[PDB]
């Protein structure tokens, strides 16, 4: 028996932006969000509108709304979020 | 002739002198025909050779695609472009130097822009400085190849500036803003010089992205860039006690 | 003569009379003074040096010989001072010797020389070659010595270093650092040492690190320290990031129960010099896999768009040896933690069993086993303690430490001379990209230039960072040839073409 007591760890973060994807849920923009993967056919499957900020970053409306419920900055550039499309 | 030049493409080294002499005969035999002296050469050989090289490099590009990533595909395509540039010089007439290689380009790079333009994102935004140079010298030959790479670089520079000039400390915001935009400008001017040959298209993309990122309006606020850049000069030209010798401020 | 031309003339002729009196005693006999300037400088006679400076300042070609003689004297004095240095304390002694020479000569210039821009520039030009002593067929040891000096004084030590003493030492250190002329090498070496100091907690105070980075930024600008400040910020933020992670796990639907502890140090990728190049396809143990998964979920939810490259050679956990009648708790890297948790399965273990469980490379596994047997935590059944095809390793229950908490890892030091070679290689690579940028910019702006002017402008432009070499410039030219960004003129090979 060897009980670990601490795991002081080091990890390198790098930007993982891939083309035509939603950064919050790591899912495609046109496809539904990871919150709407459940009850896939219950709704109209159109309320997952593509929200574009003034910084030209495309997320899902549910994803960016859940992000803005806690943090008011865009995930991919740490700048304040401003809707300009839908 | 087409079969033996294809054998030269397949790795073997045939008799260069014999092939070049036979190909040169088709244009030397018409030297006394001053009206269209190369029409026989461009009718008997150059058009069949162009068709053969197009139908060969189409299959070659399709074969390269099935077993190579886009990072390796562009270096292989550049290798075959260089090999065709060399082998069309020791075999063909000078007038056919450019027609053949334009068939080599618009079969491996122009036919697969949808393959090479879908990778301009993962290559530029990861600063793949070798793959970026390969894809630049690959898409430069094609007419409508660059205006997507330029846009992807402009998006990358815009986001890099936005990340750099954000959440700056309010104590030294005027200096931090200017120095952050300056380091982004320096990094993406040396990338454009070393990797993308310093084109005015890519530097115009850099200028557009930096103009978009310096002049970023906060939500329901005014652009603080002029105020910050005036405070930079005010704090820099004042008689500060942190050194600032004159030839450094200049 | 000044007095008797003041009292016996017109004020318009004050300057002509003294000009004629000078250029009859101190410009006609210029050789008589230039033959003794060397003596009075290399012997440092105060009154004679002051008088000769006063005499030769007014004459046109009076100072340059004296300036050159003082520069040669400072060059020889600095070379004599930084010649026979004890290797035990060489990084400190070299910088202190250059500081002593600089202070003595700047006081000599500022007191008996009516301190001049030309003479102090001569002191700077002499000390630049004093510090950059390229030994025959050797690389410049100055940037490594300076980086090691900063590392030695900024690290936690029991020698005794008050904060004020460190602050003034680093304030005076910049007067040596500004002479270094190899700032790429110093930047890479300081980043390499600062990474270890920040990660392993060796820094005495992060205020000192912020102050040193500020000093280097003042000395060179916000592109020398553009990545050192990111390295410092990513460690000043990690406390708040770990607080956010603890809030995340304590604000979940169920009980998360990581189980042990967690002190993650998430770092930037482009800022830090660290890399996953020495990868071994390490298999994270079961007792850490849950915590890795939970932090991956947290970081994918709270910092979107970022991927983590978990560095395992820098992870340093703590393990309790309660199996072997616990004498202490070992501060052990996760590489050796994996093989110790494989030892947890059974008393005996084989090399192939370790390769199957931890999935590490042969070299990393060998290094971990060697580090464990050096501490004698485990023992080898075979007489040959080195690894073999099977090499059945056993558990040494006899070994017991003399402390209640003993650290078995040593990664804070030994400096890995292979990493020094890699650092110099990365320096050369960055130099090559800088030279390529300069060459492409010049050959696009001008489109026609020869070898001599191009080399001179490259040396003039790139001198602020490093000293360029003709071989490196030719290598960059060949690289641009390979990338079809440059050619040479058909009329003359001296000129160059462009695409
Ligand atoms: Zn989404
Ligand atoms: Zn949804
Ligand atoms: Zn954004």
Author numbering:
A (entry chain E): 21 to 106
B (entry chain A): 163 to 412
C (entry chain B): 246 to 744
Paper text:
We recently discovered that FEM1B, a substrate receptor of Cullin 2-RING ligase (CRL2), recognizes C-degrons containing a C-terminal proline. Furthermore, we reveal distinct dimerization states of unmodified and neddylated CRL2FEM1B to uncover the NEDD8-mediated activation mechanism of CRL2FEM1B. Our research also indicates that, FEM1B utilizes a bipartite mechanism to recognize both the C-terminal proline and an upstream aromatic residue within the substrate.
Although most of the identified FEM1B C-degrons bearing substrates contain a proline at the C-terminus, some of them, including CUX1, do not end with a proline. To understand how the C-degron of CUX1 is recognized by FEM1B, we further solved the cryo-EM structure of unCRL2FEM1B with CUX1. Local refinement was performed on the dimera structure of unCRL2FEM1B-CUX1 to obtain a 3.60 Å resolution structure of the FEM1B-CUX1 subcomplex. Unlike dimers, dimera adopts a ring-like architecture, with the two CRL2 protomers binding to each other in an asymmetric manner.
